[PDB]
Design a protein around this ligand. Structure first.
Ligand SMILES: *[C@@H]1O[C@H](CO)[C@@H](O)[C@H](O)[C@H]1NC(C)=O
Ligand SMILES: *[C@@H]1O[C@H](CO)[C@@H](O)[C@H](O)[C@H]1NC(C)=O
Lengths: 75, 82
């Protein structure tokens, strides 16, 4: 049954390698996931800034136009 | 007496391999789980960015509309200048 011990010990070595491999994997996947999410975050941010610029121009115009209308009124 | 040493060493090495097998199993579980999560979060982000784009567009439209509305009003105010 000692031969059995040898075969099993070996089986355990193999398994350990596989586990290490998976681990490297998971860690890697987490890294990738993290960076993609980071890209999207940044695109959402700049996206936002451009939307602020937009709404600002808008409110500004609404104001300048309201004013014009009023000026026309008193005329 | 080595025989006993090998019954033991064997027993713990057996148990050990079993532990690793469950271990790997759990690792795959966790890996696919992580993929899932990843794809999910990104879908969310995508939907978010799309929405950002439509709102931004609508904004730009609105701005132009108001510049025209403006050029009109301005011409009236110039008419009054007479
Ligand atoms: C499992 O893998 C690690 C990392 O190489 C190794 O150092 C350790 O001895 C292994 N464990 C067993 C019980 O074989
Ligand atoms: C461990 O898992 C492998 C692959 O499924 C299997 O072939 C092997 O017999 C298992 N070992 C033990 C100790 O259960």
């Amino acid at each position: 049954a000692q031969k059995g011990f040898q075969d099993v010990e070996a089986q355990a070595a193999t398994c350990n390698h596989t586990v290490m491999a998976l681990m490297a994997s998971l860690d890697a996947e987490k890294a990738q996931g993290q960076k993609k999410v980071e890209e999207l975050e940044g695109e959402i941010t700049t996206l936002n800034h451009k939307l602020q610029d937009a709404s600002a121009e808008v409110e500004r115009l609404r104001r300048e136009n309201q004013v014009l209308s009023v000026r026309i009124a008193d005329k």
